[PDB]
Design a protein around this ligand. Structure first.
Ligand code: FES
Ligand code: FES
Ligand code: FES
Ligand code: FES
Ligand code: FES
Ligand code: FES
Ligand SMILES: [K+]
Ligand SMILES: [K+]
Ligand SMILES: [K+]
Ligand SMILES: [K+]
Ligand SMILES: [K+]
Ligand SMILES: [K+]
Ligand SMILES: [K+]
Ligand SMILES: [K+]
Ligand SMILES: [K+]
Ligand SMILES: [K+]
Ligand SMILES: [K+]
Ligand SMILES: [K+]
Ligand SMILES: [K+]
Ligand SMILES: [K+]
Ligand SMILES: [K+]
Ligand SMILES: [K+]
Ligand SMILES: [K+]
Ligand SMILES: [K+]
Ligand SMILES: [K+]
Ligand SMILES: [K+]
Ligand SMILES: [K+]
Ligand SMILES: [K+]
Ligand SMILES: [K+]
Ligand SMILES: [K+]
Ligand SMILES: [K+]
Ligand SMILES: [K+]
Ligand SMILES: [K+]
Ligand SMILES: [K+]
Ligand SMILES: [K+]
Ligand SMILES: [K+]
Ligand SMILES: [K+]
Ligand SMILES: [K+]
Ligand SMILES: [K+]
Ligand SMILES: [K+]
Ligand SMILES: [K+]
Ligand SMILES: [K+]
Lengths: 128, 128, 128, 128, 128, 128
């Protein structure tokens, strides 16, 4: 699969809303470092965080076990299949689109995420 | 959580349909062995197959890795959270309600399943 | 289970001895942050460190594999069941009550620990 | 470590009691197959079942996850360190000396077990 | 990757030698069941046994942990990357081309194996 | 096994070449801290990084999953058997002798490594 990704700090510095602004289009016209914006090839069954790390991208994580929110990302297009986790609520998964990249792989041919979503205020209570 | 379970072979011997017949009510009036019908306490985060095995229930499995259909169950009420798996399609998960018990835990306080769902014909192609 | 916990740095700043002082009673009259003193609900089979992290508590760890002492805690009441580990001696487990929280779950309904026990001098040689 | 082992079916066929009879001495004068009596070299940290399997010994197991009793053994001398497990009670571990070989390694230089202890009647309720 | 595979029992029934006979060409002119001869798509990082099982192929395995020889295959073209294992010798890996399919993934775009190689006499001592 | 190890920063500060200089002999005449030069006993099947950490050596790592280069070491004598990994090329493994210590164990009775090899320029692109 292809996961296009945008570091949440770029969304936050610009005052963008990940559903009203053309976050991926506008970050492609900037000159962000590759770990902050780009597209990543990720096999089905391959963890997104580990595909990012194998490109040398030091995306956030702490536990690597679905027991924190440090690796959270928001999926804007496509889907990410996760291992079992009890930290995110059903509403955070189904409506807020929070996925944990340490334990999630692409579930669609094309996925688009805003990673580093640990800075979202509702997730700050599970960030270690 | 409590997972009430019914072995699919009882549904199949009786010609029941798991959505039109009172499968759990009618199996409670029979005298099935406890591994074939009952309710199981399963912790959040605890695999349903392993909670069944720790009661001495030898529910079906082969791979234990989300790479076959031998541990499939159909969830009729509540939900089961699974580890990442590529063997079941989105339609099998979202519409047919197939969950793999070797890698799935209860995702709700009350869950009801028809286990041993590996005998369903559409899953016979992934049964090893 | 319920694990009541006290960060070892509070015991050490106060010159308390974890077996002569009323360490939990006295920390309950202070105004410590919740990660430093409180009670945690932890399922049987659930790692104590991961239950702490899912509350947003950034308790110490490095390896997460029972190969260091950074996640050590001293269990004062109840018990913690650990995965296999060769780093702690029998005397450290049976007499000094050292448990590794990254690989240990509650083994009793009520457990009381002094976590962050990596600062104990006899464990400083295995702290990374 | 060295784990000397005796298949429980030899103890049971002979009417021996694993604490009054010279079970290892008497099985050494028989002509059992090597998987039924012998001594096994097992590294610290190496699972006893997997050291037996790498000698081609097909010792019993089902789940390999500490969720059944099929791999049980009784440790008569030395000790076996296990991963976390909730299936055995404290009394079964501390007084009856039940260890699960799929998730246990030697915890002493010399260990002696009676494997295939799944045939003990008090464990028959967790045998799958 | 593509792994073309041939069940070793076909090689053995025909008196073929996996290095002098056109084992894959000749099995393609037979009418073997798909689990006995075919080509399998296997992701890098995906275990060959689990890719076979997800096609419903019940290829041999016992331990799934690199502690037996039941899942052995001989790689004739390309390579399979394995997890750490101590059961096979260097000569069995480098010269006899034995790979354990439960813990090995394709290491080349095109791989060709003769699976079910547990029937080879030199591996019979580690078959459980 | 015995793994003799030398921190790559000592090789780099001295302008040594790990194949022309007597890197281990010359570091033995210095007064490096034990984590920077010494010999480590590591069981077959035991990860080298975890054997180092259990001596209190805080050797580099990030992912612990074979998805980065932070734990790289160069093996100068003997060999290290690794779990499956897709981050290193065949040439990096076979010719440059790069091994990932988080997922590698000794594959020979005597092994000699230059750890902390993440500072090598060709590996800097996979260092997180
Ligand atoms: S790093 Fe904690 S859940 Fe992903
Ligand atoms: S036993 Fe194969 S997926 Fe559960
Ligand atoms: S963090 Fe190292 S043993 Fe727990
Ligand atoms: S085989 Fe089930 S606990 Fe060991
Ligand atoms: S099934 Fe035992 S090593 Fe693969
Ligand atoms: S720490 Fe990343 S591969 Fe070893
Ligand atoms: K694509
Ligand atoms: K802002
Ligand atoms: K750009
Ligand atoms: K993220
Ligand atoms: K969940
Ligand atoms: K949504
Ligand atoms: K309930
Ligand atoms: K029928
Ligand atoms: K009944
Ligand atoms: K089932
Ligand atoms: K999926
Ligand atoms: K549905
Ligand atoms: K309680
Ligand atoms: K002090
Ligand atoms: K207080
Ligand atoms: K701790
Ligand atoms: K131990
Ligand atoms: K004690
Ligand atoms: K010995
Ligand atoms: K008898
Ligand atoms: K004999
Ligand atoms: K046993
Ligand atoms: K226990
Ligand atoms: K005892
Ligand atoms: K191909
Ligand atoms: K033949
Ligand atoms: K054919
Ligand atoms: K095979
Ligand atoms: K090896
Ligand atoms: K060869
Ligand atoms: K040696
Ligand atoms: K230099
Ligand atoms: K010295
Ligand atoms: K290293
Ligand atoms: K590789
Ligand atoms: K070389």
């Amino acid at each position: 699969p292809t996961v296009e990704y945008l570091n949440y700090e770029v969304v936050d510095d610009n005052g963008w809303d990940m559903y009203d602004d053309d976050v991926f289009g506008e970050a492609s016209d900037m000159d962000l470092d590759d770990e902050d914006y780009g597209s990543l090839e990720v096999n089905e069954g391959e963890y997104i965080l580990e595909a990012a790390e194998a490109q040398g991208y030091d995306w956030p994580f702490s536990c690597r076990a679905g027991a924190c929110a440090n690796c959270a990302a928001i999926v804007l297009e496509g889907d990410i299949d996760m291992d079992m986790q009890q930290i995110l609520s059903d509403e955070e998964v189904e409506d807020k689109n929070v996925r944990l990249t340490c334990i999630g792989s692409p579930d669609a041919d094309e996925v688009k995420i805003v990673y580093n979503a640990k800075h979202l205020d509702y997730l700050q209570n599970r960030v270690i």
